[PDB]
Structure formats: structure tokens, C-alpha cells
Subunit: 88 residues, 3 copies
């Protein structure tokens, strides 16, 4: 079936749910006012996520795997970019 | 194989481990006094979870996927209920 | 494809990413100074993880599943050991 990963922060809370479906990962967001589709959309058959706070900023890392290749995607306040993670 | 998701809170800690096995998700709980089977039992081939605290209350969200349908299950102090999440 | 699980702590942060690949789980670590391969290497087709702090100590629980058997692996400051978790 489809495969999901979830993270949350604060007391509202904000929630992010990533779904790997048919080889692509999309993102659903809850910030207390209804679910909506987030900016993240990248290839992947499997997804995991972790997030942390630094002061009042959220940092998200999404690990997207297709075949034996895992790409780390980073949210640090200004869009998603590929991170330095490799599996080695 | 079977597929799991885990979350934890506090310093004991409390741990919840969800296992999707043969199309159903069950829940194992640790609160410092041995593992036991929790109340959660719902359909699902894949599971993810996140949890947060608000004061001294735990909130748990379990994302249960069967086929292309993902159901959010909510624990907010008084049993499990379906939440508003949709994948769209 | 391969399957991952991720956790993080602190503000650096420290990140641990577990990958189940070809029936074994390995561990990649980030502590602010580059990714490296961690000590964890055990059988598993599926992996989940949770971690918590107690004061200034990290506790990690990795749930490694092969077939219908799930083994809990514990990091509590001094190597990985099997924990008491069972699925029942
Ligand atoms: O719109 C909300 C948003 O900016 O929140 C942070 C990330 O989850 C983004 O992908 C998402 O679009
Ligand atoms: O700022 C981005 C970055 O340095 O954040 C920490 C890790 O996720 C790294 O792989 C990643 O490149
Ligand atoms: O008995 C412990 C319990 O109430 O803890 C909160 C939830 O994890 C429930 O499913 C579970 O049964
Ligand atoms: O109180 C339940 C609820 O509002 O909690 C926040 C989100 O998990 C929603 O989908 C869900 O319906
Ligand atoms: O070297 C860093 C390390 O000790 O950090 C704690 C655990 O993640 C270990 O498996 C890992 O080797
Ligand atoms: O100290 C190890 C241990 O007691 O930690 C809490 C749970 O993870 C248990 O299954 C595990 O045996």
C-alpha cells in the first residue's frame, strides 16, 4: 500500500504527514486550521521524517528512498533542498 | 515483513509501538511496568505515528494506510476516533 | 525499495537514520560534523525508531522486524542490546 511518515511540533500542533504513493512523496499539513497540501513533492517509494526546533524555527528532514538511493530533503525556513546525507 | 511505528514521551518513558501485520494494526505499550497490548486495533497495511504533549496530556495521531486510503486515528485522552485527515 | 527511520535530538542536532536494505539494518549518524556510519548493524527488513532524553543522556529504541518477528534494540549510553519488547 501507500506508506506514510509523520512529525509534529508545538501545542496547536503543526503536523506534517508525508505519503509515498506510486513512486512519489507528497506532503499534507495541519497548522490548526484544516489540512492542506504542502510544497514538498519529490520522487520516493519510502519516506521517513524527523524535525526539531531551534528557538522558534522548525527544521525538517525527509529521507526519500527510491531503489537503493536515499535522498535527504531539508526544510530550514525557505524551501526544500537536497541535504548532504548519503547511505554509504 | 511486518511494519512498525514508534513514539515515546516523558522520562519513564511511555512508549507506544504500532505494528501493521497481515492487514491490521495493533498497539504495544510500555509505561515503565512491562509491555502490554493497547486498545488500538484497526485495519492497515502501513502505519506511522506522531505524538505531542499539551501540559500533562498526551495526544497521539496514527496514520493507517490500506491500499491508497489513509485514515488518521486520534487519541486525545478518551479513546481512539477517526480524525479529519485526508490525503487529497 | 529500502526503508528508513529517523530520529533527532538537541539543537545541533544529532540525527540518526536507520536503513533496512537487503534484510539488514544499518545506521548513519550526524552530530554536526559530517555523516558517518554508526555501530548499529542487525537483521531487519523493516525499522522504526524513537528516542528520548533523560537529563543529558540519549536513549534510543530501534524496532527491527524480519518476517513476523520484531526485536527491540536499545541504546542507553553503552552499546546496543536486545530489549524486553515482544509483539504478542
Ligand atoms: O505551507 C506550509 C509549509 O511551508 O510548511 C513548511 C513545510 O512543511 C512546507 O513544505 C509547507 O508548504
Ligand atoms: O543544513 C543542512 C544540513 O547540514 O543539515 C544537517 C544535515 O541534515 C545535513 O545532511 C544537511 O546538509
Ligand atoms: O492502556 C494504555 C492506553 O490507554 O494508553 C493510551 C493509548 O495508547 C491507548 O490505546 C492505550 O490503551
Ligand atoms: O481533534 C482532532 C483533530 O482536529 O486533531 C488535529 C488533527 O489531527 C485533525 O485531523 C483532527 O481531526
Ligand atoms: O558513534 C556514535 C554513536 O555511538 O552514537 C550513539 C549510537 O547511535 C551509536 O550506534 C553510534 O555509534
Ligand atoms: O532498559 C531497557 C528497557 O527496559 O527499556 C524500556 C523498554 O524499551 C524495555 O523493553 C527495555 O527492556
Amino acid at each position: 500500500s501507500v506508506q506514510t511518515a509523520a512529525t509534529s511540533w508545538g501545542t496547536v500542533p503543526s503536523i506534517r504527514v508525508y505519503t509515498a504513493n506510486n513512486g512519489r512523496i507528497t506532503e499534507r499539513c495541519w497548522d490548526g486550521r484544516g489540512w492542506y497540501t504542502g510544497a514538498f513533492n519529490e520522487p520516493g517509494d519510502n519516506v521517513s521524517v524527523t524535525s526539531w526546533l531551534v528557538g522558534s524555527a522548525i527544521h525538517i528532514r525527509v529521507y526519500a528512498s527510491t531503489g537503493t538511493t536515499t535522498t535527504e530533503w531539508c526544510w530550514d525556513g525557505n524551501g526544500w533542498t537536497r541535504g548532504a546525507y548519503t547511505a554509504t
